[PDB]
Amino acid sequence: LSELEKQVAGTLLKLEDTLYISSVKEIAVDGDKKAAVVYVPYPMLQSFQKNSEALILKLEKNHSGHRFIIVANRTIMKNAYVFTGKKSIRRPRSRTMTSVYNCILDDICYPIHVIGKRTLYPAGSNPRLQVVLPKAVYNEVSERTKTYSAVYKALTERDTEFIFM
RNA sequence: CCGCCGCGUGGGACCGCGCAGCGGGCGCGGCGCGCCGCGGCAGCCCCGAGGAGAGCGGGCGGGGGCACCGGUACCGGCCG
Numbered sequence: 001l002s003e004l005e006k007q008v009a010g011t012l013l014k015l016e017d018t019l020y021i022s023s024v025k026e027i028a029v030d031g032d033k034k035a036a037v038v039y040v041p042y043p044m045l046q047s048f049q050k051n052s053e054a055l056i057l058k059l060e061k062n063h064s065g066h067r068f069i070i071v072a073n074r075t076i077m078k079n080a081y082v083f084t085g086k087k088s089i090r091r092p093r094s095r096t097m098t099s100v101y102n103c104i105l106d107d108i109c110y111p112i113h114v115i116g117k118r119t120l121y122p123a124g125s126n127p128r129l130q131v132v133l134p135k136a137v138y139n140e141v142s143e144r145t146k147t148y149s150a151v152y153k154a155l156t157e158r159d160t161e162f163i164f165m
Numbered sequence: 166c167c168g169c170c171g172c173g174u175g176g177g178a179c180c181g182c183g184c185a186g187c188g189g190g191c192g193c194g195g196c197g198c199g200c201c202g203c204g205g206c207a208g209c210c211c212c213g214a215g216g217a218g219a220g221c222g223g224g225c226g227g228g229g230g231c232a233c234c235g236g237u238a239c240c241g242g243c244c245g
Contacts, residue, residue: 041207042207043207045207072207073207074207075206080183081183082187083183087183087185088183088184088185089186089187090183090186090209093210093211093212094207094209094211095207096211098211099211
């Protein structure tokens with residue numbers, strides 16, 4: 001129920017010639033360009049994953065002004081066990097914070113599979129994570145690394161940066 | 166202030182244990198035993214230790230057990 005959703009829905013209705021979205025989030029970047037994150041419901045992420053590179057390209061080409069990213073919305077629970085007083089309810093591991101952040105990171109760059117992760121602990125600077133991408137693909141993704149860092153920082157307060165190795 | 170392996174409040178890093186869905190309606194103030202939509206949930210498996218065990222393939226070796234079998238030599242006997 002906001003302007004962006006109206007035109008993106010119209011777009012989607014134009015593209016076919018069955019799948020719907022949950023919400024849309026827009027995150028700012030240092031440059032005037034912004035990012036739009038589309039929250040896909042979990043059961044159909046794979047439905048929006050097969051041919052989604054074309055989908056994002058067409059969406060960007062229709063309404064310019066900021067890049068489009070597709071991610072799923074996952075829930076995080078804050079207790080390993082829940083004590084109802086009589087028995088105990090165990091939290092599934094899929095609902096942890098560490099798993100969710102890793103899945104988000106994979107989803108942000110879904111077409112390109114992450115090759116490694118490292119976190120550095122400088123003497124004074126806040127610890128930061130740096131990930132490693134395939135050396136084959138670069139110029140395709142070189143121009144969208146600041147946006148990736150910004151969106152990852154927004155969703156998860158953890159900061160990061162990108163390189164190729 | 167000083168004879169406490171017990172009692173209460175707090176913290177909860179470290180050390181060890183938690184198999185048996187949830188939420189709403191019937192339903193009484195609350196809790197149970199039950200009856201109901203699944204119509205509300207992302208319903209319900211960390212990874213796979215230069216730990217271990219099991220498996221396939223490859224060659225390696227005076228490793229083990231059973232039967233079988235050759236060769237001089239020591240000894241004894243016999244022909245010359």
